Symmetry: D2
Amino acid sequence: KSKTEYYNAWSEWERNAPPGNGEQREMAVSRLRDCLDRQAHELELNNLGLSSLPELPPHLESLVASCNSLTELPELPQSLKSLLVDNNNLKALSDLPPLLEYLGVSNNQLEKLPELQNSSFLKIIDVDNNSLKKLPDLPPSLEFIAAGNNQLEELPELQNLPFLTAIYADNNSLKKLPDLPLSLESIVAGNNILEELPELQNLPFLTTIYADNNLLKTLPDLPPSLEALNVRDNYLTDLPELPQSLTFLDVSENIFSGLSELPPNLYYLNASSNEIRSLCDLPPSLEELNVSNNKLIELPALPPRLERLIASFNHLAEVPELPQNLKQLHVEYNPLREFPDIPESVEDLRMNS
Amino acid sequence: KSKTEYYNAWSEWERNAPPGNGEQREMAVSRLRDCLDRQAHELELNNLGLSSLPELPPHLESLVASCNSLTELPELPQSLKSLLVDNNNLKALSDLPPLLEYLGVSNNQLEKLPELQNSSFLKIIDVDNNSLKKLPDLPPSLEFIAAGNNQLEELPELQNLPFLTAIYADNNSLKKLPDLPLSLESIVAGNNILEELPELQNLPFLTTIYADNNLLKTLPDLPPSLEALNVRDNYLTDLPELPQSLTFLDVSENIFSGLSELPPNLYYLNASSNEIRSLCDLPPSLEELNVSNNKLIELPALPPRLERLIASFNHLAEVPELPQNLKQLHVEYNPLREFPDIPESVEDLRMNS
Amino acid sequence: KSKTEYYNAWSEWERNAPPGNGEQREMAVSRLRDCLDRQAHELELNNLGLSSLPELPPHLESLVASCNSLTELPELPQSLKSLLVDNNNLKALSDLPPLLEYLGVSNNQLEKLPELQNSSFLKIIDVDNNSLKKLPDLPPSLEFIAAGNNQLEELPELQNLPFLTAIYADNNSLKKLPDLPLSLESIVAGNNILEELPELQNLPFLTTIYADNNLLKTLPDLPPSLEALNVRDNYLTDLPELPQSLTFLDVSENIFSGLSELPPNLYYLNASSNEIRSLCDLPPSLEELNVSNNKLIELPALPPRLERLIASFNHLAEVPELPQNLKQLHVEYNPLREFPDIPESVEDLRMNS
Amino acid sequence: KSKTEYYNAWSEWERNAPPGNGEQREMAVSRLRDCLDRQAHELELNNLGLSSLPELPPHLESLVASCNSLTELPELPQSLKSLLVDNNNLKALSDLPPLLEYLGVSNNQLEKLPELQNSSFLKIIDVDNNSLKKLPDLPPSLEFIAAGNNQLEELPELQNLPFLTAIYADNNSLKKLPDLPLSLESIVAGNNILEELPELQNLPFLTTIYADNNLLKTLPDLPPSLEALNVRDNYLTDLPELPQSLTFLDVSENIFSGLSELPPNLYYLNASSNEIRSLCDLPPSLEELNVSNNKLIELPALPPRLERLIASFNHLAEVPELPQNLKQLHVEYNPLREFPDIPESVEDLRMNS
Ligand SMILES: [Ca+2]
Ligand SMILES: [Ca+2]
Ligand SMILES: [Ca+2]
Ligand SMILES: [Ca+2]
Ligand SMILES: [Ca+2]
Ligand SMILES: [Ca+2]
Ligand SMILES: [Ca+2]
Ligand SMILES: [Ca+2]
Ligand SMILES: [Ca+2]
Ligand SMILES: [Ca+2]
Ligand SMILES: [Ca+2]
Ligand SMILES: [Ca+2]
Ligand SMILES: [Ca+2]
Ligand SMILES: [Ca+2]
Ligand SMILES: [Ca+2]
Ligand SMILES: [Ca+2]
Ligand SMILES: [Ca+2]
Ligand SMILES: [Ca+2]
Ligand SMILES: [Ca+2]
Ligand SMILES: [Ca+2]
């Protein structure tokens, strides 16, 4: 097609803008034209309220039409490497362009996804916030898949994905997670109905695990290099040995009656809303301690690195001597006989006896 | 009717309890019987999930059937002095029992009220939270009427009610309030669309005025003995001379660029969310000062009686020396160069630089 | 003393009002005089910012000096039956007037209480919010004692108090509660460090138990006529058989993986923040169901009496058909495939997918 | 220096790690060594709790030592182009390295900054959240300066900064802003004490203006291509003609009695907490309308593009027909005679009558 044909196709599309629907087709056409004229790789029509897209520039490699009202996508060029149409009303996707590297279709109404396993270059799949009941098998090229906030009852096999480093499958109805790929560096699967996590100890690169809001009673042996573990709101009474690489630990809303050990390099500990009666010594690396809403009548010595202390809703008669770099002290609702001396560093303070 | 007839009428009513509707007719019948047997003045069937009431004990003087699913009321005895059926699904009321002194029908679906002006003993009318578009003229005996949260566009004439001491007509669509009765001690008419308040200065007994959330640009001369004035969220830039009897003042969410004067006996001042750049000296009587969300770069000397200081969301570099009985200090979000010394009395503290 | 001596003593006291401390001694003197002149039983000097009280009218039976800055109390008349000086700075109390029936000294700085067991008429002791480390033994006349928010590590023996019907000892450091008196109708001891509750099954009149925020792992057999049980935030996985008299149940923040049974007349159930995976059928009497923040993928049929449904933060794909009298629906943060039909009765709605 | 000297200097520094202070000098040394060995341009020692840094690798171009407890910085290489030491305890900075392009020292305790005007390559200055009372004159190379949350009473001259495109000077005590540079694309100066904004109409590139929380009574003629205007919490009753480029408008907490006009391409309008009695027609481009807490008894037709409608705390009897792509409906606290039909698109709903 000649530019004129595109221009006219686009102007026609523009004229067809549903009156009053605030569709910014003029801007879109302008983007389309510029894209066509510049022979630009990417076309960005974000937040233009487009209820549809006209034919796309012929050699578009990247279609960014996020935040529109697209219920359908125009045919995608075989040159398309990146499709970012998150926040649209897409209920379906045509088979992916052979060169698709990035599939950004989060916040849509996708009921199902087209086959993905044959997408030799599909590295990122973001189908987060859709109505996916199932995910097609994933392409070996998959490095990242966000399929959170869907209605997935199962995830396709993942262990054989050589490059899958990040999985977001939170807010689904996963009862189990498939065995994880050795390459996995991160898995966010909170708010599912995971009875248990798959084996994790053999995941040397898994550094982030979010399995909060699940039905976990125990955690498997953790990834040896786990750095962030969020299992907030589960039924954990204990934690397996914690990788010393763990710097972020959220075991809030579990049923810990205490924390016997904390990783030596933990920066963040959120153990709020457990039944923590006592905290083991805190690692000097600890910067944020949230043990809010527990049954602590006493906090252990606060690490001098502690910047955020949230120990509100506990039975503290006293807050230990505050570290001099403490930025935040939320010890609200504690039978504090007196407020602790507040370091000048404290910027955020909340205390209530 | 004999007790047996009542018992049986009641047992029949009990048996007619919609299955599964959790109606506690058995308890109700038990109450009914006890009432009948004891010849008790009052029958209390609160929160029994009753979708209806059977015939009431013959000489019931007080019917308390609050929190049920009554869509209709059984015929009320001519001996009824008190009708408390708040929180029901009453869409209408039969003409009131001649001796009705208390009409408690708040939280119902009353579309209209039966004539009230001829209720020689109607002292309290609580039709709050209903679907009243209008209130019938009020009985001279009216001492209290709560008709708030209705769809009243007007209130009936009130100035001629010799004993009306309290009017709750907040949350209605009143554009104006009728002239108020000399007897009025309190008027709560916030959340209406009052363009102005009626003359108030000639209301020697009016001690409480709630005209918050209206369309007030100014307040009339206030009741000389006004004690509580809540005109929160209006378009006030100024206040008329404040009665020295004023102990409670809420002028929050108005457009005060400052407060030049405060009643000498003010206990509570909520001037939050105005554009207060400066506060006049605070009366030593002040116990609670809420000037949160203003444009104060400085607070005046805090009265030693001050117990609650909410000056958060201001431009305070410093919080003045805190009074020794200060219980609450919320100065969160102020460019505080430093937190003020916190009196040991402070139980509730919130500071954020 | 002659009135003049009192007047002058009072005027002298008035003149001694610390300048600027907002003490309303003039009003106090006015109250004092009126009390003296009227020979009134009660003297009410509430919220007058009084840092002290002058000699009290000679035959005062009731001293109400709540909300002042009293650090000391003037000698109390032997005729004093009621002492209400809550919200003051009292650190100590002289031995109680022999006729003291009501000891209202909540919100003070009482470090200790004078002997109470010999107060033949002491019926109500409110020493809530003080700095009591211990409570003196209680008088057999004690019907009500609120000693909550203190530093009590133990409560005096209570089982022998024939008329003790209400105990508020929440917010203390009670590890155990003494055996409860047969007369006990209510015990509020939340926010203590109760490892367990004392035997309760032999308390036929105990209808209210608040043992929230403690260290309860189990509850003893409950008072047979228990009506309200709040054991919010404890370590409960199970509940003993629930008295059918139970209408209020708060087992939120415990470790329930489910609720197998609910009292047949339960009006209120707060089981939020547990690990509830399933709810047993709800009693048709249920008006408020709060199972917010659980692991419910499904709610049981909602009782038609249900007025408040808080099932937010769960894994609900669907909210069951809403009862027609539902006033509140908070099902925010649930993977709801769709919002349920909202009954016209719903006044308070919050949904978030 | 030889690597060994650096290694040893670093190991010595490491050994000097204050015991128990959680300083991760080992990791730092590891980073230092790797940096030295790799001859890397950048050294990243973020969040290592370092109370000090040892001598830096000799040809470091970028020092990233954010989130540490640095109170002092080691001598910076003349090769340093980027200094990112935000979130430290730096009270002073030595004269900047001649090649400094990025000065990231936000969240420190800088009382003053070294001369900056002679930093020929200083493009980004981030001294946000410090204790700067004044900013040295800025270098002509300055493209971005964030000096927000300081104690600036004045900003240095800016109009002559040819490349200054972004100024963050919010949360200071600026009474006035210097004339703005033609190059300015964004100015965030909310929470100052700006009596007025400088002339803006001659700023063709100024697309973002945040002057919220100031003392603005009026806005100057706006930058012709202004896209985002946040003047939340000011004393605005009117707005100058709004650039049609305006897509983001926050005039919340001002004193608008209404909005007569809205930019045709406005996506976001936050006019909450004004005294808006009526809204002009909404541009079809409007995606978010927040007129919460106003005095609206009626909302205008909702643009079909509207995704977020926050009209809570108003006097709405009815919510206009909701657009089919509405994602959020917060109309809580409105005397709604009935809830509007909720489009299936609504994911976030809050209604309260
Ligand atoms: Ca045009
Ligand atoms: Ca969704
Ligand atoms: Ca270990
Ligand atoms: Ca707990
Ligand atoms: Ca708790
Ligand atoms: Ca029975
Ligand atoms: Ca209502
Ligand atoms: Ca005056
Ligand atoms: Ca303001
Ligand atoms: Ca503000
Ligand atoms: Ca006087
Ligand atoms: Ca206390
Ligand atoms: Ca049972
Ligand atoms: Ca849970
Ligand atoms: Ca949860
Ligand atoms: Ca090591
Ligand atoms: Ca700061
Ligand atoms: Ca115009
Ligand atoms: Ca307003
Ligand atoms: Ca309002």
